[PDB]
Design a protein around this ligand. Sequence first.
Ligand SMILES: O=P(O)(O)OC[C@@H](O)[C@@H](O)[C@H](O)[C@H](O)COP(=O)(O)O
Ligand SMILES: [Ca+2]
Ligand SMILES: [Ca+2]
Ligand SMILES: [Cl-]
Lengths: 324, 325
Amino acid sequence: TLTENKRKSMEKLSVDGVISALAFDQRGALKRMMAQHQTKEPTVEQIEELKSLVSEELTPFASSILLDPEYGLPASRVRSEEAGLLLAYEKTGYDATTTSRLPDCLDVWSAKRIKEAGAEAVKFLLYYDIDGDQDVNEQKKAYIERIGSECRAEDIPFYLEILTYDEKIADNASPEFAKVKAHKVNEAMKVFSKERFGVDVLKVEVPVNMKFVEGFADGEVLFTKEEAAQAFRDQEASTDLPYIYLSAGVSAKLFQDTLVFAAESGAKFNGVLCGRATWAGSVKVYIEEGPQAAREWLRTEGFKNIDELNKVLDKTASPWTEKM
Amino acid sequence: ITLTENKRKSMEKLSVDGVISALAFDQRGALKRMMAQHQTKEPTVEQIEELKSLVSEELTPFASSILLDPEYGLPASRVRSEEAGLLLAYEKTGYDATTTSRLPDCLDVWSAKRIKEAGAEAVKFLLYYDIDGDQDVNEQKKAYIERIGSECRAEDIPFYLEILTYDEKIADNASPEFAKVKAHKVNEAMKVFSKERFGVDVLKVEVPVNMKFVEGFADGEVLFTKEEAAQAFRDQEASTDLPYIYLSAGVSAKLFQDTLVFAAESGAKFNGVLCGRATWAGSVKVYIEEGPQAAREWLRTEGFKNIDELNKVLDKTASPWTEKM
Ligand SMILES: O=P(O)(O)OC[C@@H](O)[C@@H](O)[C@H](O)[C@H](O)COP(=O)(O)O
Ligand SMILES: [Ca+2]
Ligand SMILES: [Ca+2]
Ligand SMILES: [Cl-]
């Protein structure tokens, strides 16, 4: 059940019920990427410009774009007229001296202001360990309730992004984390699918680390294909809400092969909010060679990434208009 | 200007014939400290919760509603008169005295949804505001109130915004220095948060004057004539079209009551009060020292007399909030 306005906004973010969205709200993550190629700290102008370049060159090929309000408003104004807009509402990153990873809204923003800035959706990122401290998770659930209520009042779709972790596992790329990932992802989805959180779309990880799956793995194999497939069916069984996948910065090819595997396995996912798998290469070029070189990278390599993704989405994603 | 069906029903449960006679008892750290004064042991959760229940049970039959804190006040809320509405506070108490920003912060495991689920007919939130303060601080404060106002719209529960004014550069808001600017701080803060975007249903505000410096009411130095004081009330009435009620903290019951009369004479159309310590402060010493049954007897006699006298004054001074609809 969508209100008239939430439905209109979902339509502006989608094509034929599929979300082929471009993600560039990266801030903390962007900065870590930029640091690989220069000693100097990134300036505001540089961040704004790279976002604007990606927006201008690639949104003609996306149903919508996700940007951050801190650096991304100029970029939002040069997006394709056919592409919708999501704006991020959370502060970037988390405190690495504690395990709680508590969420925090941008200080001078509200769901109302995000709508006033021309967004068709509010996006919020929550770090969640289903097995973690219960009082921490109580605080997290309470915080999402507030945001869900705001979005109900402002009549703007609520896109909740969940990134999972384990309080006691330092590296979520490790085999140790791979072994519990499906549990973390699928049980978190089940919680945040509860009516009281007011989510319209879940933006989630695939429930497997594909690098440890038979046929995809280049080293140790932790899972057969059938086991991986069952993780995807468990994910589909964990919600009746629309959901879309994030890339997590894997290779464009691995992400594409994952979508194919997801669909074959029985996951009726409704699109992607994909960023780095598409544009990651532009960061090095932008820093070393500058804006025009980056533009040319975007028109060629960038386009090729997003075009190949779109072809894969076309044959793998399911429309959210059927979740209704 | 307008109320949904459920917000209107809730407002009616909070009032009597359009007048809010609300009993305030969301005190936390403040209440605990009073308690200490009368006894040796650190006050217990048991004690803090019990006094609230006694006050709630014995005095809410004579109030239109009661304001409680979710942290200690839920048991007290459940023994309130069935004819009394409930407001629950949503803010963390106090402020960082090392800084001047006094930023607002909601209780960590509460939401407007949870407040409604706990049986409340209103969400109360206390904001400290200096209209003349740091513009980025105030931008952050405005964003925060927008969020809560949106929550309350979605959960369809009245939003009561309490504003307490201060100056970043004046330590004592009881000083003559603050008195000279208080009308400015109060009235301009009301103008800000009366804007539609903040979603406020009722403002809970200070009287726009320190009556202790007004001619006729002052024991010492006199800063204002009666006419100057009255103009401040008329300016306050003109600062909002929303319902608003007065908070009493800072003055004696007798002076508060005299203030209500002066307010009405001056042309203020206030819609009630949120009155606390005046009404039950006396039981606190009796509860700690003579036990619970003694407090119940104090509340039934002195306690009733206090709230009854207040109600008699409200009857001749307050205006119904339905005349603002
Ligand atoms: O840490 P930051 O600086 O806030 O940004 C990265 C982080 O939010 C990620 O979760 C992305 O927002 C999301 O995954 C979409 O990007 P991709 O994963 O598709 O590349
Ligand atoms: Ca449901
Ligand atoms: Ca399902
Ligand atoms: Cl207190």
